[PDB]
Ligand binder design. Structure first.
Ligand SMILES: [Cu+2]
Length: 105
């Protein structure tokens, strides 16, 4: 697979590292919808609002099967560590019109 998962479940936003590469989710949007990182980087999404959200990569993007991230409540976080160069699109399971991508250089 093309990413590893440091936290299987959502975790508290207060425990996101200071350093971390963060994508906020707010107002029904990913607030960095075209994020550029490098091989080896960890990305952390943080839901900033009451409406639940996730991140969801369809089958074949990060692995043979889909990666459907866990449901994230307000001030919950979820991370992926990207290990292979490429561009990886995702959406929100609940709200598929909400889309983003991670461009891994
Ligand atoms: Cu959503």
């Amino acid at each position: 697979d093309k990413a590893t998962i440091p936290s299987e479940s959502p975790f508290a936003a207060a425990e996101v590292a200071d350093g971390a590469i963060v994508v906020d989710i707010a107002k029904m949007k990913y607030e960095t919808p075209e994020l550029h990182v490098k091989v080896g980087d960890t990305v952390t999404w943080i839901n900033r609002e009451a409406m639940p959200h996730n991140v969801h990569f369809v089958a074949g993007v990060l692995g043979e099967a889909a990666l459907k991230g866990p449901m994230m409540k307000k001030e919950q976080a979820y991370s992926l560590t990207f290990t292979e160069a490429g561009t990886y699109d995702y959406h929100c399971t609940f709200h598929p019109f909400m889309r983003g991508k991670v461009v891994v250089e």
